[PDB]
Symmetry: C3
Subunit: 146 residues, 3 copies
Amino acid sequence: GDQNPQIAAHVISEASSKTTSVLQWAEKGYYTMSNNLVTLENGKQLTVKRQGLYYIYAQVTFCSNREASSQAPFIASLCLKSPGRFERILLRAANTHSSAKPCGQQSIHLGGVFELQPGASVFVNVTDPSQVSHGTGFTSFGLLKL
Amino acid sequence: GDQNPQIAAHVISEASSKTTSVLQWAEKGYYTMSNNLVTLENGKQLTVKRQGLYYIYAQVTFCSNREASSQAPFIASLCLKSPGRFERILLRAANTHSSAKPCGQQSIHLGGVFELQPGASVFVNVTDPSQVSHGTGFTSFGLLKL
Amino acid sequence: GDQNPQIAAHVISEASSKTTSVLQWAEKGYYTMSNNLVTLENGKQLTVKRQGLYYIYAQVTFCSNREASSQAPFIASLCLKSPGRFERILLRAANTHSSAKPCGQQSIHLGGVFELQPGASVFVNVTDPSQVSHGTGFTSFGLLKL
């Protein structure tokens, strides 16, 4: 206050206690939720209350074994739920593990501009949630209205 | 309409049928072209009609063999054509294949703020176009005016 | 002039001549410093003179041996100095080297939205500065006010 009412979010990773495969987040650590027109709904997803173009991003780090998760690539997907609609993938990134190298810590950065409908919402899928790296700083998600 | 006339683009990968090495794009899938002051020109490049600072980004995923493409690193470059000017690289990212691991799916994220002249334009170069991953969600390109 | 007075920066890598581990930058090559309300202070850090939300990003490429830097992962961190405050990490990315593969060129992209206080400032830490790749286009840092 007053220095906020742009629409923007930045949210921090947290481990799911359920079989997952969508990422959970919190409003903790270095977080942003600049106003009531974004919210973290659990979800866990970022829900916008205004239509328009948004820059949307995620970062996922994981630590992984090649010979153990041999299935085969890690992939993180930015996905969209719009009201009364099926779900879409917006972005995906793959990284390999590569059989048989050891618990390698790797990151993924995803980002682009998309239209959102009022009522929104965006989330992140991964193939390998147990392998995900829970920070600090390592795994995050957010958006900004342009 | 009306919810658009920011300058912004987001465009989706597509395979070239020519020996390449610049990426081709389409206005398909989750795409954005928010007004007539950006266009996808083929090219394929994003052409802006206004000067100013832009955030510009690409994401390139590829699937690659180490022992096969042994040449040696994959590199994706964000490059600039300005009117009556030579061409410049703005950003580059390298990823290794690493001789001899198998068709490993890897991604690259590129992004930064740059000045563009009226009439523009930006494109993406790669070393290894055949290895590029054509989505969905995998390979993309765009920009936003700040 | 006039086409600038957004707050934005984009700055280019340069090798430290000191034992480091924070990255040095220059206002060279494709750089941006859109006004006196951002500066590159050495530092080297980006210092803002206004409070508010910023998109902040870095890209770090490095070339690395697994068996040589065996310690074990490369990590780049976006960090914050706020006036009269301790220092915080905003973002981190890890990449592995993976013992024993050869001088592999790899990149990292970091980015998110954060609040900055007047007087600011942000910088990038790495584990392995000697391994860092000094462009052109390879290693960069910047921000934009939203």
